[PDB]
Amino acid sequence: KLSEHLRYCDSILREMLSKKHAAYAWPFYKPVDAEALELHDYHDIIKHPMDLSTVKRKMDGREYPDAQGFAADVRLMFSNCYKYNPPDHEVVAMARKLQDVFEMRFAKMP
């Protein structure tokens, strides 16, 4: 069903999940486990959690109306990371390098 633009998005998503960016992309593979990491305030601070597996799920299930809907979730993921964690945290540095990859790919979408 996917439109040409939403195919390009699935291409970007496929790249963000590859071994090429694993060094800084792995904390975003699955939802943030507030249990395991013992983050008792994560869901009180992050109202709308988001990760790459969820984005893949919605992409496979064709839940995105357009490319803008895709980008919104991907940025929501990064926004939550910036919002919850201190500015000096390594996971923030990881998010920034991965977002560099995303924004660069997304901007060059035909």
Partner: peptide, 9 residues
């Protein structure tokens, strides 16, 4: 205040 720890277990 809770801080997420990426360090392996």
């Amino acid at each position: 205040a809770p801080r997420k720890q990426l360090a392996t277990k």
